[PDB]
Amino acid sequence: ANLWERFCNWVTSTDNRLYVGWFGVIMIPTLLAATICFVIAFIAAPPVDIDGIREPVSGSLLYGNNIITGAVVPSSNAIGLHFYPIWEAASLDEWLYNGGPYQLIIFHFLLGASCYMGRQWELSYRLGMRPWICVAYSAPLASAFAVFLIYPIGQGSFSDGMPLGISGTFNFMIVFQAEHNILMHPFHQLGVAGVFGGALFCAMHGSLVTSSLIRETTETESANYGYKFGQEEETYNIVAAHGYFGRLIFQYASFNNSRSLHFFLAAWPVVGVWFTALGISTMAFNLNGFNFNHSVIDAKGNVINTWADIINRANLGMEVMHERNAHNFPLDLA
Amino acid sequence: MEVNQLGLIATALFVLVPSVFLIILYVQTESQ
């Protein structure tokens, strides 16, 4: 047909080695920009005054970091939530000093990843698949939005978003516990059940299907060669896996519908990680973990400490040391 | 940075030895 139709047909071709799609049209440029900036900043970016106090943190390999300590440092607290594109700086040197690469990377990345999710829907439509893989991915995506966007919004500064580094991640987690007692928050406890249980059910399903592979190979070749790609039939005996697992526990604590079983594997980690993403997102608005400090007292009124009071002494150690030069007034209200 | 200069040779062999192992097994597979 005409030119715009050739193009539309290419963009949405199910024959490209990698599907592009209309979401891909936004995803590709934004991820490329985020990736190139992140790689260059991680190696070469100079120190960044993250907390706005003219106390720059070195995050890059060339300025004395290794893989574990290096990071792209969040933008300055002096900036708060202001948009700080390159063109708003008077010079690249000013932009690097105040942590601009961080804004550029995370905005392009949230955009790119939001479109990655749409792309998963889009291709499943072109293939005639059911559409809800993208729903599963919403759990990890939601989590990234929380640490990179929502938490900075509630607290009023990208300087408190998560750093883009291994040790920077730890910094963010320790400060968080100090300020929100996240360990004592049920949404985070739901996140741990999500991922623990996901790991468990992951090992279980794999162990249980592997346990009931049909002998289709000899002892000298990999069992795996007993499965041929696209084969009409199944290569394990689900009835035997139920027979094993039903007896391991009891007959009805075990799944015998392959569809019910796989739906469960999808829902358990996704739901739990939804909750822990919502946990960061609501602690962003300072609705914090349970507070049981001095909750037990005796007939006279002495405080009888519990394990919650012992946690609180660790929290206090984090509180009083973190960003040690950044507070002038006794309360750390954001 | 005052790093351990034996780290370089440790890292290099950490990579080369097992990688070579794999490459050798793969190539002789493709040739039968």
């Binding site: 190696i43 390999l61 060339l62 790609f229 696209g230 | 790093v3 370089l8 290099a12 990579v15």
Partner: peptide
């Protein structure tokens, strides 16, 4: 030398991605 070592390893992985996608054993329906 340490910076060079980290960047070299990271660059080999990126090349590994390229070959693993575009030069994979094609999955065929046998």
């Amino acid at each position: 030398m340490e910076t060079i070592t980290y960047v070299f390893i990271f660059a080999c992985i990126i090349a590994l991605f390229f070959f693993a996608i575009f030069f994979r054993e094609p999955p065929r329906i046998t």
